[PDB]
Amino acid sequence: DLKENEEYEIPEKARIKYKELLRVYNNNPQAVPESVFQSRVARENVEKLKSGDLVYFKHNEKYVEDIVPVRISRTVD
RNA sequence: UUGAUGUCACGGAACAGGAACUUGAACAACAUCGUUAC
Numbered sequence: 675d676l677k678e679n680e681e682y683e684i685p686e687k688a689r690i691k692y693k694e695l696l697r698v699y700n701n702n703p704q705a706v707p708e709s710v711f712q713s714r715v716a717r718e719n720v721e722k723l724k725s726g727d728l729v730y731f732k733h734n735e736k737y738v739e740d741i742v743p744v745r746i747s748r749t750v751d
Numbered sequence: 752u753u754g755a756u757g758u759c760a761c762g763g764a765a766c767a768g769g770a771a772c773u774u775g776a777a778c779a780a781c782a783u784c785g786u787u788a789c
Contacts, residue, residue, distance in 0.1 A: 702783075706783090706784080711784090712784090713784080713785080744784095745786060746785050746786065
């Protein structure tokens with residue numbers, strides 16, 4: 675159920691936090707040796723959030739504060 | 752592009768003053784990855 679008439683805008687802080695999270699996901703030293711068990715961010719080497727793709731998020735009062743690509747991922751301060 | 756009866760231009764050092772300097776132990780422990788079940 676894609677609800678209409680309920681959309682929020684992305685400030686600069688959320689974008690730089692997502693960029694930092696992607697940089698942490700990509701160049702990890704402790705990763706899995708195979709290139710098939712990793713997630714979609716680490717396998718296909720995503721660098722920025724594109725036009726349309728499904729992202730988990732959390733907002734308050736029409737402004738979003740954080741966005742994560744999977745269910746249980748890491749949080750940046 | 753000169754004009755004649757008169758040119759010391761070999762008659763004149765591009766010369767004189769300014770610190771590539773200041774700051775930095777080749778050192779080191781806690782995880783990484785996401786969902787399962789009613």
